[PDB]
Design a protein around this ligand. Structure first.
Ligand SMILES: *[C@@H]1O[C@H](CO)[C@@H](O[C@@H]2O[C@H](CO)[C@@H](O[C@@H]3O[C@H](CO)[C@@H](O)[C@H](O)[C@@H]3O)[C@H](O)[C@H]2NC(C)=O)[C@H](O)[C@H]1NC(C)=O
Ligand SMILES: *[C@@H]1O[C@H](CO)[C@@H](O[C@@H]2O[C@H](CO)[C@@H](O[C@@H]3O[C@H](CO)[C@@H](O)[C@H](O)[C@@H]3O)[C@H](O)[C@H]2NC(C)=O)[C@H](O)[C@H]1NC(C)=O
Ligand SMILES: *[C@@H]1O[C@H](CO)[C@@H](O[C@@H]2O[C@H](CO)[C@@H](O[C@@H]3O[C@H](CO)[C@@H](O)[C@H](O)[C@@H]3O)[C@H](O)[C@H]2NC(C)=O)[C@H](O)[C@H]1NC(C)=O
Ligand SMILES: *[C@@H]1O[C@H](CO)[C@@H](O[C@@H]2O[C@H](CO)[C@@H](O)[C@H](O)[C@H]2NC(C)=O)[C@H](O)[C@H]1NC(C)=O
Ligand SMILES: CC(=O)N[C@H]1[C@H]([C@H](O)[C@H](O)CO)OC(C(=O)O)=C[C@@H]1NC(=N)N
Ligand SMILES: CC(=O)N[C@H]1[C@H]([C@H](O)[C@H](O)CO)OC(C(=O)O)=C[C@@H]1NC(=N)N
Ligand SMILES: CC(=O)N[C@H]1[C@H]([C@H](O)[C@H](O)CO)OC(C(=O)O)=C[C@@H]1NC(=N)N
Ligand SMILES: CC(=O)N[C@H]1[C@H]([C@H](O)[C@H](O)CO)OC(C(=O)O)=C[C@@H]1NC(=N)N
Ligand SMILES: *[C@@H]1O[C@H](CO)[C@@H](O)[C@H](O)[C@H]1NC(C)=O
Ligand SMILES: *[C@@H]1O[C@H](CO)[C@@H](O)[C@H](O)[C@H]1NC(C)=O
Ligand SMILES: *[C@@H]1O[C@H](CO)[C@@H](O)[C@H](O)[C@H]1NC(C)=O
Ligand SMILES: [Ca+2]
Ligand SMILES: [Ca+2]
Ligand SMILES: [Ca+2]
Ligand SMILES: [Ca+2]
Lengths: 390, 390, 390, 390
């Protein structure tokens, strides 16, 4: 009988290793007989019994005749879809949850909560689904472009916390947090501090008390806005990550942003969503981060880690841990998630490896997974193995 | 060990929103690898654990070579099929329930009842299936064309109520209601009042005591016949909806029908099945309706609502809630259904969007879904995104 | 904690009606994207929860490159497959049970028993499978061609009864009966009486005391051999069906066999497996049968019935019930089976509808189902809808 | 509550028979509509409820455009996949467990354990997954090529025993055995005795206290290294099996290795994974093995058996029990596994039948299965039925 889930101590390990590649378009060739879905913004969320691989589809397949428009972000056909992790997301394997061009999902211990935003840009609408039922909505508040995480929300004892943001992509987007219980929004949380631009937060539990998020600023800085949300008081605060190892793309050179922690620096315009995930141990906390190998291009994906300290106040360079995607291969969005073992949580990072060939052809993605696994060093990189010409 | 289901209070909300689109022919192009089934008359029915998406297939897929005859209404190949709502209705995903060119289905809390009418026009036959087992039949009583709802029947305390009808499409069709329990017919019900012509009723619970249906008159009027069925006494009465906002297609201008409520008016010839769903509150009853945007063509679909009053007596215009499907897009049959949240019911309306290219090509449909969901105004419309040329 | 099944009283009804068509080759065209399996000798068996549609595949699909051989009876590639009844039996939907060119299956209330015969003609081997495990075997005793029912075996209190036979197609073929429990052969039953040729028995439960079988004589008579098997004392007895309505194909004109009951007669060479099922009542026993509409060809299928009496002694013509398949459509093997309702058993007859374009193209079959359904008369026939040039 | 599994006494039987063929490429022709996965190194492992069919895929299908490399051993794309035994392993039916170019799997009665080694040749990494969660890793020790069984590991009382090996392919490869419990390596076992080269062990339980393995020597001999592992003491000893029937391929003539039991002999270069499975009886143990028909080539597959005695000491030829695959057909890797019947275990051997047509086209395999079944002699051989040109 189902009880509410809580974050547990992470399971023992000291390094990440290549775990699993989901590359649907390995079967999408004209010579083939398969129907992989055209997608982007994939993420993974796990419940006590099952892991689900989510994505936003353009409601089209490779091969097919609806490639035109699959390079855009929003339209009336896009849908949040999923399969069990390990299954290839095809037309028939997938299930279509709801229309959305921005999404999230999380399992609270008893049931799946699905999140989907669609509607017109100036008045977008977030929709909440608990299992099969549509249960709530939330309205755009800045009337620019209401949007959400493109990664998993976080549930503790029945309460599910979700980042949403609204505002200009090149101007101001003040983010908020929805608290959602059994499909219904029961509280809005307004963060304090450096709030001028926060989008596409990647969140997780530092403990039973605190959720932390590494987010994206699309205008002002190449440093990641770092949220600290206390779930006991339902309050949040945002300051920029102090580490010399700037995680955004585009970014400047490491350390080159001189001055105090809060200094915005150069190359702030533009952005990318970043992997972030906690390794909780008895007396220390590990924070793992991913960023592209290239400073200005969505190419490659490397892994970093730092134990304890305060991300807001520490200049310290993050320890480079290894290359997950070499700079020759595409490396786009990345997200954190946790797999539930018998008595312990297993932190992972998934990486969106987009197949980009311009607007003249199809535009989709593969997903690579790296998980905390044993000891030593990260050993192997990941390729998609897709020839976009076929 | 499940209990019989009963209609519950509706979930909180005050507006409908775009929820989900099932457009299987987005994957029916020649350079694709999918086999979506060719169907029409789709509808949805929900049990306590699952929503099923039903339709009548022509036992043929796109791409395929059996297009010829997919624009006819009846033949020896048509079958009632279903998939789990959210899955694409393909050859492999679908399950074939029974031979039928007219159908319904509903869950009683324990098991599925599947209804499927087939046979020669002059002597058609209704078939009842309970789970896997064929359990009963009902013979033609007017010998013109026995037929049924093309949407979900309704169960309360293990008793399922089903509308059937038989008669000319341009003359008298005096409908009846069957009371079906565990797959077997236990009582016929003969409605009184205005029984000239009643077909393809879209029914639902107004309360524990009353079932209401918004039906179709294909011969005499563009006002929808309105059934009130007392499930405590198993009697039914029918009168025409009095509202100025005529729901049928074709129809004259709104309010144009001079004279009192019972006035049949002009443009009675023809018709279309219309969406109808209840929003049950503690102290009021909300009635949600859909109708085409075009006055004469099966094009577009708009949403409407009025709270309480007597549908038989009120000439009051229905409130316009929004455009679910614009007039640029096809809008055919519509239906009501209810999704089961943990403690309350969620009213929804489905829209059949037919792909009509004429007799020389394939003839099928997509399904769009809107549901009561939060507050405010209906925000976005639905397109199928299908080019029939591919 | 589950329990053995026993035959129950058949459930109310007085006529059969068209239920379900499984016609996978409707989707097997060259311009399609489906993969129906190529099969023959299909049958259906039902346990307490689901029905399974079994067949013998040639391990090849349509469209495909392996049409050569699909009109042959035995080879090293043939397997017994199934799907849940309602599903299209394709490459991906089907499950492969074991190598076999002759088969049977039945559920005892706890688990499925799968029967499969393969091997060389003069030393064939019957193989039994219980759940996932291979459990027993039986050897050729005549060294001509060991073979079995090609339809459901019959289980009572955990004991399952299966007909096998060994011998020449144009000579002696003395069948035996295996009593099987939980995958293992516990007893052999040697039938007394008219035993010179008995094959492809279609069997059902007349009572808790008696199994009856309508079988096929391929060399001596156009009357069908009829088995009476006493499951209480494990003894079997065979005599020819005395009825003027000769059920084999080919056959002489009805009644035209001159002599007493045991009289063999003319046109005894050739034969076909025939449908036969019991309608059990407290009052009386109904016996439904099926035979081709043509006397000399596998064309059409007619439904017949006599209530009570002794088919060993009664020469009276069986009552014609209706045409399940017209003489314009193919009509091959037919089989009996019973779907389990909550309280009652529903008798059905399935009809293999073979697509026969000769040995230069593919060779497979559709399945049509008719079940006892309500009262009145049988109303509609079944067509496959398949054009073999597509 | 689910308890730990232990080996049980074997099911009654005297001989193996052809059970099942899995040949996915029968449906891989260019004029078809299916997508069989391209694989090699298949094996099978069963738990209390289900058997799974594993393999190592090249992440490509037939037909498709990624054949280049499919004859390769290791790359960054290979993955451990599985379907339920009985299902065709296609793109859609299969589940992707983890990246791997060497694998293993087993069920301990509660949960599955999946083994997958990947990484650089020189610093390879073994990965352990328990259900959904990656739980442990193990590093290369000889830094030459860490690798594992490519067949089922073995679980008793929740303790899973698995063979790993590292070192030269033409020199020393000293193996180790891991004790894995609920996904974690709790003990390593260092074997004594003859240990210069042992790889690709096929292991099974000989009792509740002894596991035996028939392994491969790719460098020094054509006799198979034979591991004995005491699971009570957690110690293992390895000596070459002495029988004159050399099970390796390539091999010299039977008996031609002159000398005492421990002598190496000629033609010890090269190797093949070989079949081995126990038949456990009351006061007797059976030992079934398989080896190729050709002495030099990977063609054909014969079955051999011997009861009791010591494989370390006994020189006598194994009793030839029949041809499973004729020398005209491909016979590559073979492996042992056991199916769990209700009260006993059924021994089987699986055979990899590689479709080899060189480096310029696809490279994959079918899986053939023979199991202990009844009495007498092994009756029929297995062909794939695949024409590589189609
Ligand atoms: C966050 O809070 C949750 C809930 O308080 C913590 O999990 C709880 O504490 C321990 C986790 O190790 C569990 O104790 C165990 O009890 C079971 C019997 O239920 C027993 O088998 C074990 O030997 C152990 O004593 C406790 O049950 C568990 N409670 C729930 C409701 O899950 C969690 O550890 C906290 N996370 C932190 C501190 O990072
Ligand atoms: C229509 O009639 C049915 C039949 O009585 C009504 O269903 C009943 O609804 C009540 C509350 O509305 C349920 O009571 C609740 O039971 C749960 C435990 O099951 C308990 O935790 C709650 O505190 C509450 O007492 C009752 O169980 C339920 N019975 C059945 C058989 O469903 C239904 O409410 C009526 N719908 C209307 C009036 O709109
Ligand atoms: C063949 O013999 C078996 C004996 O096992 C008969 O099965 C039995 O059928 C009777 C029919 O009335 C069942 O009685 C019922 O029991 C249920 C218990 O839930 C009760 O609610 C009903 O009111 C009724 O009394 C009986 O349970 C059943 N036995 C078993 C073990 O299931 C079967 O009917 C015989 N076949 C014939 C007569 O054709
Ligand atoms: C090996 O050990 C297992 C575990 O004790 C034995 O399995 C038992 O078998 C008996 C029947 O002989 C059952 O009544 C017990 O319930 C079984 N125990 C468990 C835990 O399943 C097995 O018989 C032993 N002997 C062998 C394999 O020869
Ligand atoms: C709602 C929305 O359109 N989000 C965009 C997002 C956005 O353009 C920027 O972050 C700026 O606000 O970035 C792009 C992107 O890949 O950079 C993906 C997202 N596309 C989708 N989620 N569909
Ligand atoms: C049984 C039957 O053929 N019902 C018809 C329906 C019917 O003609 C009208 O209700 C008037 O009598 O028209 C509609 C329609 O599209 O208008 C299609 C239906 N097609 C199917 N349900 N198959
Ligand atoms: C085991 C076997 O080969 N059975 C044959 C069967 C047989 O040839 C005759 O009955 C004569 O004994 O008839 C033919 C047939 O359709 O007439 C189909 C069967 N084909 C298969 N079951 N494979
Ligand atoms: C890990 C690994 O690559 N194992 C090899 C194996 C190996 O080369 C020899 O056993 C010598 O060490 O050869 C066999 C083989 O087919 O001979 C295939 C294996 N391929 C894979 N398992 N991928
Ligand atoms: C379609 O079927 C009808 C009726 O069977 C037939 O008259 C017509 O010629 C067919 N059309 C084509 C294009 O074959
Ligand atoms: C057809 O099948 C027979 C059966 O063995 C075989 O001899 C023949 O060569 C086959 N022909 C082709 C073209 O495959
Ligand atoms: C296969 O790939 C290799 C590189 O890995 C390349 O050199 C070779 O030409 C390729 N083969 C073909 C036929 O393209
Ligand atoms: Ca930035
Ligand atoms: Ca009208
Ligand atoms: Ca005959
Ligand atoms: Ca060797």
């Amino acid at each position: 009988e189902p009880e509410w889930t809580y974050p547990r101590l992470s399971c023992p390990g000291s390094t990440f290793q290549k775990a699993l590649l989901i590359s649907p378009h390995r079967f999408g060739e004209t010579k083939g007989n398969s129907a992989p879905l055209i997608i982007r913004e994939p993420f993974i969320a796990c419940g006590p019994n099952e892991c689900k691989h989510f994505a936003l589809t353009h409601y089209a397949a490779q091969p097919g005749g609806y490639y035109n428009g699959t390079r855009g972000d929003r339209n009336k056909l896009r849908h949040l879809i999923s399969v069990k992790l390990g299954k290839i997301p095809t037309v028939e394997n997938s299930i279509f949850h709801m229309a959305a061009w921005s999404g999230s999902a999380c399992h609270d211990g008893k049931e799946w909560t699905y999140i989907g935003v669609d509607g017109p840009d100036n008045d977008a609408l977030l929709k909440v689904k608990y299992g099969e039922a549509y249960t709530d909505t939330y309205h755009s508040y800045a009337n620019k472009l209401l949007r959400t995480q493109e990664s998993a929300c976080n549930c503790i004892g029945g309460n599910c916390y979700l980042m949403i943001t609204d505002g200009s992509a090149s101007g101001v987007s003040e983010c908020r947090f929805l608290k959602i219980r059994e499909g219904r929004i029961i509280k809005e949380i307004f963060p304090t501090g450096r709030v001028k631009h926060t989008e596409e937060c990647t969140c997780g539990f530092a403990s039973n008390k605190t959720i932390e998020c590494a987010c994206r600023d699309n205008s002002y800085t190449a440093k990641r806005p770092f949220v600290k949300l206390n779930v006991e008081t339902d309050t949040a605060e945002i300051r920029l990550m102090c580490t010399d190892t700037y995680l955004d793309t585009p970014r400047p050179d490491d350390g080159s942003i001189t001055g105090p922690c809060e200094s915005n620096g150069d190359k702030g315009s533009g952005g990318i969503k970043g992997g972030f995930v906690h390794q909780r141990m008895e007396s220390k906390i590990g924070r793992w981060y991913s960023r592209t190998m290239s400073k200005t291009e969505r190419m490659g994906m490397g892994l970093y880690v730092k134990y304890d300290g305060d991300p807001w106040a520490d200049s310290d360079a993050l320890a480079f841990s290894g290359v997950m995607v070499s700079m020759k291969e595409p490396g786009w969005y990345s997200f954190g998630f946790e797999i539930k073992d018998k008595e312990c949580d297993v932190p992972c990072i998934g990486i969106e490896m987009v197949h980009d060939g311009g607007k003249e052809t199809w535009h989709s993605a593969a997903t690579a997974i790296y998980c905390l696994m044993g000891s030593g060093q990260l050993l192997w990189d990941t390729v998609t193995g897709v020839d976009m010409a076929l």
